[PDB]
Amino acid sequence: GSLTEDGLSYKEKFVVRSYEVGSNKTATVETIANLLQEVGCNHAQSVGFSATTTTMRKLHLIWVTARMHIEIYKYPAWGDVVEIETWCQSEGRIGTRRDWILKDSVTGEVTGRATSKWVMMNQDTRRLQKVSDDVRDEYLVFCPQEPRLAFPEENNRSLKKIPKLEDPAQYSMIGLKPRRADLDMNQHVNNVTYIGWVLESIPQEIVDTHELQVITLDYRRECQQDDVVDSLTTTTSDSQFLHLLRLSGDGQEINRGTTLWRKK
Amino acid sequence: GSLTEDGLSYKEKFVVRSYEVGSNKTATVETIANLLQEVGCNHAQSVGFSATTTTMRKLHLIWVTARMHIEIYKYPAWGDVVEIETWCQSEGRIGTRRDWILKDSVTGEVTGRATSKWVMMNQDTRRLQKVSDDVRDEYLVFCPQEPRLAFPEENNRSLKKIPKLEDPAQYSMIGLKPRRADLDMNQHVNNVTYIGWVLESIPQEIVDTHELQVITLDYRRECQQDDVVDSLTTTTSNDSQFLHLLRLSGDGQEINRGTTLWRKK
Numbered sequence: 001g002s003l004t005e006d007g008l009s010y011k012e013k014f015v016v017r018s019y020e021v022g023s024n025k026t027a028t029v030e031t032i033a034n035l036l037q038e039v040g041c042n043h044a045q046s047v048g049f050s051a052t053t054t055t056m057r058k059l060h061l062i063w064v065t066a067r068m069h070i071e072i073y074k075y076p077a078w079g080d081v082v083e084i085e086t087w088c089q090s091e092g093r094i095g096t097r098r099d100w101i102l103k104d105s106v107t108g109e110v111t112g113r114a115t116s117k118w119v120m121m122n123q124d125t126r127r128l129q130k131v132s133d134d135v136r137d138e139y140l141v142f143c144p145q146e147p148r149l150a151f152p153e154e155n156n157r158s159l160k161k162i163p164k165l166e167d168p169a170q171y172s173m174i175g176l177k178p179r180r181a182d183l184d185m186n187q188h189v190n191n192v193t194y195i196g197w198v199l200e201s202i203p204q205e206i207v208d209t210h211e212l213q214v215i216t217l218d219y220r221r222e223c224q225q226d227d228v229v230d231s232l233t234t235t236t237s238d239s240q241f242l243h244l245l246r247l248s249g250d251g252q253e254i255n256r257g258t259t260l261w262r263k264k
Numbered sequence: 265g266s267l268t269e270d271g272l273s274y275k276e277k278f279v280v281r282s283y284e285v286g287s288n289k290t291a292t293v294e295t296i297a298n299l300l301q302e303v304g305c306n307h308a309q310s311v312g313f314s315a316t317t318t319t320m321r322k323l324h325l326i327w328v329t330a331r332m333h334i335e336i337y338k339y340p341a342w343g344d345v346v347e348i349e350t351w352c353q354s355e356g357r358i359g360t361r362r363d364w365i366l367k368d369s370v371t372g373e374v375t376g377r378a379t380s381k382w383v384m385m386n387q388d389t390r391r392l393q394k395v396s397d398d399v400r401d402e403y404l405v406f407c408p409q410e411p412r413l414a415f416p417e418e419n420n421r422s423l424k425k426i427p428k429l430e431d432p433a434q435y436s437m438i439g440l441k442p443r444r445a446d447l448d449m450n451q452h453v454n455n456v457t458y459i460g461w462v463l464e465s466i467p468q469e470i471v472d473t474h475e476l477q478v479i480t481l482d483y484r485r486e487c488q489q490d491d492v493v494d495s496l497t498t499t500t501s502n503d504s505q506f507l508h509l510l511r512l513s514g515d516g517q518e519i520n521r522g523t524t525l526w527r528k529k
């Protein structure tokens with residue numbers, strides 16, 4: 001991969017792997033979400049960042065995902081080359097936004113797009129902190145100054161408030177626990193695992209007859225390595241679902257989201 | 265990737281990803297095992313296979329892994345390029361053997377190696393069968409004629425018989441179930457998931473203080489999508505060795521047995 005000519009975004013090509021595809025021989029949404037974080041990390045590395053921290057290391061400050069919104073028009077097939085461009089932007093003292101555009105390397109057509117909201121927090125106390133002033137200046141030289149949005153439509157799906165699922169859930173997948181392949185290099189559960197756990201409560205008939213078009217996911221609390229998760233789903237409708245991930249025990253909320261699916 | 269000059273093996277380079285590494289910032293054994301199957305798949309596609317033949321597809325025959333043996337000397341770090349060469353060989357009517365050599369792309373040094381035993385089975389009845397001569401001839405033109413082994417040693421670990429773990433197991437990880445990311449394109453559990461399930465019953469102190477050097481895994485039965493698995497481990501041993509058993513949580517039906525060797529970091 002490489003930074004673009006202006007140095008304000010990063011591009012990278014990926015060839016879709018055999019173990020990365022689902023039953024329709026096209027890349028899963030978890031493979032797409034993993035490629036999004038891989039190009040995000042390479043963008044950070046190329047411009048001198050680590051959680052993508054700056055001098056926040058001495059203050060014990062990290063970047064954490066609050067929301068992830070993915071929209072896929074065409075899933076790349078096994079053997080296809082997919083090119084992904086990513087960039088960040090400051091959104092005031094609330095946090096930063098990272099966006100992505102996914103294209104077909106051959107035709108040059110947009111096959112997908114994603115946007116994510118990130119907040120600053122203290123890694124130890126887990127307390128959210130508003131983005132200071134001299135931390136803002138450190139990142140600004142790597143972001144476009146004019147707004148550049150993957151989801152430009154004012155008041156779009158990525159900015160829509162998500163409600164809390166009411167019991168009883170229509171569908172459920174209980175006793176979900178992470179294994180070592182679900183942990184990142186810092187032994188925390190990978191953000192991508194939570195996407196798979198949400199999709200576990202979608203009935204197989206929906207997965208077999210439909211294709212996932214949109215996914216919006218709020219990250220309210222992290223699931224520890226020794227935690228057990230319940231995945232809940234209710235149809236709100238194309239097919240739409242409201243989702244909730246919570247601790248199997250006391251029912252403490254870890255995620256809430258929505259998915260939109262289209263008939264194949 | 266590409267077939268070598270003689271067309272009897274296939275090479276491919278992989279750059280290690282951020283989400284592919286463990287706590288010590290090096291590629292996990294599950295990442296390595298996934299790259300081994302990816303180059304195996306690309307070798308098959310380059311020579312006109314699915315890895316079944318049109319003769320095998322009309323008979324509903326498939327190749328299935330009976331045993332996987334991996335030995336890693338140095339795990340590639342995040343950002344490193346690793347080159348893998350793979351080739352197959354007929355082992356008579358019992359089945360085929362697929363081998364791998366993993367090298368550092370920069371220094372050219374061997375950082376790992378693997379060998380797997382594959383048998384033929386009817387897709388539907390799950391009944392095994394010895395390889396027919398017309399099927400044997402179809403693959404022979406893609407394999408070296410002289411023996412070419414990743415594990416040539418007189419007394420090598422890849423061909424040792426594995427015993428059955430006796431209850432009570434020293435350690436256990438109960439209620440393991442596969443999710444959709446654990447299924448392959450044919451909705452079967454990926455062979456790599458079984459490796460992760462075996463390693464789940466290794467205590468975290470071992471994982472944190474040691475590095476996995478060797479893993480031998482027998483595949484006895486398949487885990488269905490709706491099945492629940494128990495992972496059992498007992499220390500059999502500076503080096504640390506373990507005997508492993510995967511079985512259905514309910515009736516205790518065996519699905520895997522294996523051994524792992526670990527060395528102090």
Ligand SMILES: Fc1ccccc1NCc1cc[nH]n1
Pocket residue numbers: 040043044045047049052063088096098118139142143
């Ligand atoms: F890694 C970067 C490259 C260019 C501009 C900004 C960053 N970091 C900010 C950030 C927060 C969450 N992801 N990225």
Ligand SMILES: Fc1ccccc1NCc1cc[nH]n1
Pocket residue numbers: 304307308309311313315327352360362382403406407
């Ligand atoms: F796919 C191949 C390429 C070249 C020679 C042989 C094969 N197939 C045999 C095989 C592979 C795994 N199990 N059995």
